[PDB]
Structure formats: C-alpha cells, structure tokens
Amino acid sequence: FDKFDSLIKVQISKIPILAQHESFLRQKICLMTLIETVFVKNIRMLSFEDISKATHLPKDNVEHLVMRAISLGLLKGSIDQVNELVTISWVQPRIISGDQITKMKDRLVEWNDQVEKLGKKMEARGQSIWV
Amino acid sequence: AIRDEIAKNTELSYDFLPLSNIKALLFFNNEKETEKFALERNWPIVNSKVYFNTNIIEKAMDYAISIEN
Amino acid sequence: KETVYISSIALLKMLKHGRAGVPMEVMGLMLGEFVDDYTVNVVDVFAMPQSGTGVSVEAVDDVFQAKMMDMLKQTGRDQMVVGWYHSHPGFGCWLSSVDVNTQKSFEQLNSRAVAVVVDPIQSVKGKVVIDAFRLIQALIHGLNRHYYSLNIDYHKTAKETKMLMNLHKEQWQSGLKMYDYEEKEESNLAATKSMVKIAEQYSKRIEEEKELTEEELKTRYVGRQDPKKHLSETADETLENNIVSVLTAGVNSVAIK
Numbered sequence: 001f002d003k004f005d006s007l008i009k010v011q012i013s014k015i016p017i018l019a020q021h022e023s024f025l026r027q028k029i030c031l032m033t034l035i036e037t038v039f040v041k042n043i044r045m046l047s048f049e050d051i052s053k054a055t056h057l058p059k060d061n062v063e064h065l066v067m068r069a070i071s072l073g074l075l076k077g078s079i080d081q082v083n084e085l086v087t088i089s090w091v092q093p094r095i096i097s098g099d100q101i102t103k104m105k106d107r108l109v110e111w112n113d114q115v116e117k118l119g120k121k122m123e124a125r126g127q128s129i130w131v
Numbered sequence: 132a133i134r135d136e137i138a139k140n141t142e143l144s145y146d147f148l149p150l151s152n153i154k155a156l157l158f159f160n161n162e163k164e165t166e167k168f169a170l171e172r173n174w175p176i177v178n179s180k181v182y183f184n185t186n187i188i189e190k191a192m193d194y195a196i197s198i199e200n
Numbered sequence: 201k202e203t204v205y206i207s208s209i210a211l212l213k214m215l216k217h218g219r220a221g222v223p224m225e226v227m228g229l230m231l232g233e234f235v236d237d238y239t240v241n242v243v244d245v246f247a248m249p250q251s252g253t254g255v256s257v258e259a260v261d262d263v264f265q266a267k268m269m270d271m272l273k274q275t276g277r278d279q280m281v282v283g284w285y286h287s288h289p290g291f292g293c294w295l296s297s298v299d300v301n302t303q304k305s306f307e308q309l310n311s312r313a314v315a316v317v318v319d320p321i322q323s324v325k326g327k328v329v330i331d332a333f334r335l336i337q338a339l340i341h342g343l344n345r346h347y348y349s350l351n352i353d354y355h356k357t358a359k360e361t362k363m364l365m366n367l368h369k370e371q372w373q374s375g376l377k378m379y380d381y382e383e384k385e386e387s388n389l390a391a392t393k394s395m396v397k398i399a400e401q402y403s404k405r406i407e408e409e410k411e412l413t414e415e416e417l418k419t420r421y422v423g424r425q426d427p428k429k430h431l432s433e434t435a436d437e438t439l440e441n442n443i444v445s446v447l448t449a450g451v452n453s454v455a456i457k
C-alpha cells in the first residue's frame with residue numbers, strides 16, 4: 001500500500017489521464033491489499049480493524065470494500081458485523097510473481113511438518129495394532 | 132474437633148463469607164481468632180470477606196487397541 | 201407412488217445446459233416413454249433455443265422441435281415428448297403461474313406429461329436440487345394447491361456405472377476418504393433402534409430359557425438366530441464403524457488444516 005502510495009505522487013502530476021481517475025486507483029489498491037492480506041493469512045478471517053490498518057481505510061467503508069471485493073468475483077465469503085469478522089470462503093486464483101511464491105513455499109513447509117509429526121506420532125500409539 | 136467440621140463443611144457450602152459471619156459459625160468470641168484459623172486453614176481473605184477456592188485421536192486408537200487385544 | 205426414472209445422460213445434459221444459461225433460465229424437452237400409470241421414464245433430452253421473452257409457451261419452437269425429431273429418428277431415438285425441463289436459478293423449484301399455463305399446453309398433448317424444474321446455482325457438489333411434478337418455499341405458490349409434487353430416480357446400466365467408476369481413481373486416496381455423513385446418521389440411528397428391538401428378545405430368551413429346557417428351546421428357536429448373537433453381532437458394526445469414523449475425522453482436521 002504505502003510504496004504504491006509513494007509511486008503515484010510523481011507520475012500523477014505527469015500523465016493527465018492519471019490525474020483523472022485517482023479515485024479508481026485508490027479503490028483498486030485497497031482491494032489488492034485486502035486480497036493479499038487474506039491470501040497469505042493461515043486461517044482466513046479478519047476483523048474490520050485489521051483491514052482498516054492494512055488498507056489505511058477508516059472502518060466504515062471496510063464493509064463496502066469487502067462487499068465490492070466480492071461483487072467483482074474476487075472473493076467469496078460472508079461478513080459478520082456483530083463481531084466484526086470476515087470469513088472469506090475463498091480467494092481467486094491469480095497469476096503469481098516470484099516473491100509471492102516463497103510464502104506459499106513456507107505455508108506448505110508448515111503443512112508438511114504437521115504431517116511429519118502426526119504420521120510419525122501415530123505408529124507409537126497403537127503400535128500393538130498394525131497389519 | 133467440631134470446628135474443622137463446620138470448616139470442612141463450609142468449604143463446600145458457599146465460597147463467600149463476611150468475617151463476622153465466620154465468627155458466628157465457628158463460635159468465636161474473637162475477631163482475630165478467625166483469620167488465625169483461616170490462615171491455619173489456608174483461606175485467602177479479602178478484607179473481612181473470604182473466598183474458599185488428551186486428544187481425541189489418542190482416545191480413538193486407545194479404544195481400538197483395547198478392542199484388538 | 202408415482203415416479204420418474206431419469207437416465208444419466210438426461211441428467212448430465214440437463215445440468216450442463218442449466219449451468220450454461222445462468223443467470224437466465226433455459227428450457228428444453230424430455231424424451232421417454234410411459235411405462236404404466238405409476239411411471240414415466242426419461243431417456244433423452246434436447247435443448248430449446250432462447251427467446252426474447254422468458255420461458256413460455258411460444259418459447260417452444262415447432263420448427264426446431266420436429267427438425268430435431270427426424271434427425272433423431274435417423275439415430276433411432278424415437279420417443280414421445282414426455283415432459284419439459286426448465287430452470288429457476290436461485291429461486292428454488294416451483295412453477296410460476298406462467299410455468300403453469302405452459303404445463304397445461306403440455307397437458308392437452310398428453311395427460312401424463314410432467315414438468316421438471318432444475319435449479320443450477322444452488323444445486324452444488326453436495327445434494328443436487330431437482331424437481332418433477334404436475335398440475336391439478338414452494339407452498340407460497342401452492343405446491344399442493346394448483347399442482348402436486350412427484351418423485352425421481354435414476355436408471356443405470358451396468359456399463360454406464362462402469363464408466364463412471366474410472367472417473368475418480370481412489371486407489372491412492374483411500375483412507376482419508378470420509379463417506380457420506382447423513383448415511384451414517386441413518387446408520388447410527390437404525391442400528392440403535394434395532395439393538396433396542398432385539399434387546400427384549402434376548403430378555404425373552406433369558407426368561408423363557410430359564411424356565412424351559414434347552415432341548416425344548418431348540419425346537420422353538422432354531423428357525424431364527426440366537427438374539428444374544430444380534431447383540432454380540434450388531435454391537436460391533438456400530439463400534440468399529442464409529443471408531444474409524446471418529447479417527448478419520450480426527451486426522452482430517454489436524455492433518456489437512
């Protein structure tokens with residue numbers, strides 16, 4: 001978010017077509033940010049605060065941001081206001097650059113380890129039952 | 132021999148007593164004999180007022196190995 | 201008591217066309233034969249083009265229809281038009297009155313013709329929502345008032361099934377597979393009700409067996425099986441099926457998450 005926010009400051013004066021539609025660019029950023037902060041997160045759920053700080057959006061809109069993120073197809077999921085959570089059933093497959101892969105490598109290493117311990121831990125117990 | 136009883140009673144009776152009431156129960160003529168006794172009873176005292184206080188997977192395999200012996 | 205049997209190719213062509221028309225509703229025709237008063241069999245389907253207006257009477261296209269008919273004749277598919285599919289995406293399965301009038305336009309062709317409503321979107325990888333029924337959530341429209349529901353089943357040839365088997369090759373994945381839960385609800389229920397049923401049979405055998413000799417008892421009971429063995433027996437399937445049932449989930453939760 002921030003780095004982009006820096007980038008726009010220069011060229012936004014330069015290209016007049018960018019001078020118009022700054023609103024778009026802002027929305028679009030907030031979205032992409034949201035999408036990622038969900039995509040990396042191990043268990044997918046969010047408070048509204050989390051999205052607020054992540055997107056630097058005051059939290060009223062946060063539910064407009066989420067709802068609009070769905071109506072474009074980007075997310076599926078639901079909103080629970082009472083507790084201010086966002087469940088995010090699933091997030092759209094999207095072509096991934098280099099760095100974003102690394103985190104996937106990580107989470108997949110984790111979910112390899114959990115199995116390491118579980119499988120290797122279940123012979124001991126019930127060693128008297130095997131065939 | 133009686134007082135512990137009441138004590139051993141009241142421990143489970145209800146968690147909450149004003150000190151004057153403990154004096155009432157245990158037949159003290161004294162206020163300080165109370166917290167003497169309660170310390171001897173290890174009772175944490177608040178200003179006259181006393182308070183008296185395996186994964187499922189494992190379970191499954193356990194049932195199994197118990198069955199196939 | 202009345203029922204329809206819907207062949208596989210019918211159902212798949214159905215759901216395909218429906219899912220393809222979303223979010224607009226599609227219609228087509230149903231090819232089959234009436235076995236008796238109690239049965240309609242649907243072996244075939246073909247798809248009817250869109251109309252500027254919604255699904256309606258004139259949406260049925262004569263030119264298109266017969267044009268399809270003969271070209272199926274050359275393939276030997278000759279059948280009556282036994283009903284007409286349809287879809288109410290997102291709205292569940294019911295007939296609007298406009299659905300009704302058309303359904304009548306298929307009554308006066310054949311008195312037993314049926315209506316089939318398919319619902320593409322909320323039909324999902326779990327239960328598929330499908331409905332078939334004919335005239336006189338859904339009760340708002342007079343489920344029982346203007347029309348009435350029917351029942352559905354699926355004909356499957358041996359070879360059909362055999363093709364379907366090889367879709368999923370479960371040979372590697374078995375052991376992390378959890379079979380349908382509702383089915384083991386009827387299981388874990390009907391099993392218990394049964395154990396109840398034979399409980400007092402074991403009771404009657406212990407009382408009667410008490411006051412009557414074994415030689416006399418054998419004469420009576422040899423026909424059926426030793427209700428103590430339905431306890432010893434039946435307790436098991438519940439036991440182990442429920443232990444693998446528990447463990448399997450305990451593993452899927454911690455391992456897969």
Ligand SMILES: [Zn+2]
Binds near residue numbers: 295
């Ligand atoms: Zn309709």
